[PDB]
Amino acid sequence: SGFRKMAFPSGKVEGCMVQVTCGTTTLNGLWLDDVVYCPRHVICTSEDMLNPNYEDLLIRKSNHNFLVQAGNVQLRVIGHSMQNCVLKLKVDTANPKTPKYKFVRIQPGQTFSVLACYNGSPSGVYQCAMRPNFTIKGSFLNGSCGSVGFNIDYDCVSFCYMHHMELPTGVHAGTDLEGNFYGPFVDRQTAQAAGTDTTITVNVLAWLYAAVINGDRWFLNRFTTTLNDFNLVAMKYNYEPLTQDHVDILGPLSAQTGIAVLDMCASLKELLQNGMNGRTILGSALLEDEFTPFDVVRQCSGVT
């Protein structure tokens, strides 16, 4: 019993973190095989970030401009290239601690663990979701650029995020490991606003199932609704539409608790209209949307 915001064990990723310096700019890098991946803005000063031409900034640099440190050991840079908003530094040694890994791009609503790093040193690990507006509500301070987000499936690390910046509202933006931004953002110190965010409906539903599994049943309504009638009420409270795909994804949890998906939708519809009436669900006074149906099954099934 119990339900927590749980992150993947971070050991496989800790062995990949390095410090990358270019001039006076220092951030984190990810060392896999004989390559170090980091944000392309490592080649910028504060002044360059106002309006950078990364093509020109990189063309005016050589292997000598980059200093990579894996703890106390310096790694020799023998090649460099840019792939979108990430810089790839070829080094003379393959990381002996390279785990089985792949680079994956996630969709809004999906979750991942972040290993916050400073000067190549891991400081903490936490779980977050990619918002429908493509930002992440992280916890990052200066020097955290290059920190990565990941999931683990069996013994394979799927890297999905590399941290690049903080937007005016204090939320965060980054890219996948191939340097493609999530969201309509650019790596430049300019006026950038995160769009209006919405609630990940399928995740709130999965979390209501976790609450039932843990004995919280006060909110249950069994006057079955339809997907169409639920969506009409849901869109009014800034909730993402619930697709039939989402309903199918909720199948295993529905069978486990004896609560049909459209009965949980009826329960959520009333929760939106009434509010929580001074009550809590799983230790929260709001409807949590950063747990996917797979996170709920995994945590309520003890998968390793």
Added chain:
Amino acid sequence: SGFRKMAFPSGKVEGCMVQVTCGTTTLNGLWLDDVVYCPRHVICTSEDMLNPNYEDLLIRKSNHNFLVQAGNVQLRVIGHSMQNCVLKLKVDTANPKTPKYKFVRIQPGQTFSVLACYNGSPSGVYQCAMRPNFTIKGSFLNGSCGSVGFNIDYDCVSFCYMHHMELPTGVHAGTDLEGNFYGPFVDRQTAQAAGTDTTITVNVLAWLYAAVINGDRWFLNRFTTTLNDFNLVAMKYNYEPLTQDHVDILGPLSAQTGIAVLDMCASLKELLQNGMNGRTILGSALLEDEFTPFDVVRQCS
């Protein structure tokens, strides 16, 4: 910017997790040097749940009755002893991944990271606090016994918790690594209940300072309070009394934000009176109490 329930990187503890089996009971063990530490109830059969005499159950065991597995390798048990509620299994091989470590006993209100494990394999990591009633609000299923709680500083891993049981309310109980239970709990399946859980006041105040550091001040007010009037009000909401030691511990956060401790106490009194009114603080619609003043400082600066 931002504020999250952050755990310590779990790598150094993952390299210590092993599986321990005695008969048909399997749980987790912690392998440090040539010793594996695990809950002593690994020696219990179905008839030993209510009133086990562990000294009598253990005297009947030989080294070869304990099966220890680290990955795909069986470790040979060459000795065994019991210290309070933990069993120490001496093995013939020292863990080459043993980090620098210490065993510490934490106090209520303090936080630590838990590495949830099943069959010696880590499944996830989360942060939690020792409640004033000496229970933890963890996330543990059948097979999680032996999972540990820890903190990391600049030199060592400080192990502070080993998981042993779940209570009827869904909360958890365990011991330090010397086998001493936190609270009045025992390793028996007799009906036990956790005392009234109160809110960790000093932690709520630390979290309000984190909200101010992160740019939010909506909840502040123009008042102050004496420490006694604050305690008389806060105790009516099941909050633990705030001591002068707690006031002094909040000093650096008070100096960073320019908000006197007793002025933050006045804000907290008003928040208890009014609630959130549809607002949130650091993404929460409740007053959060599982962040210590040090967790706030680490994350905010």
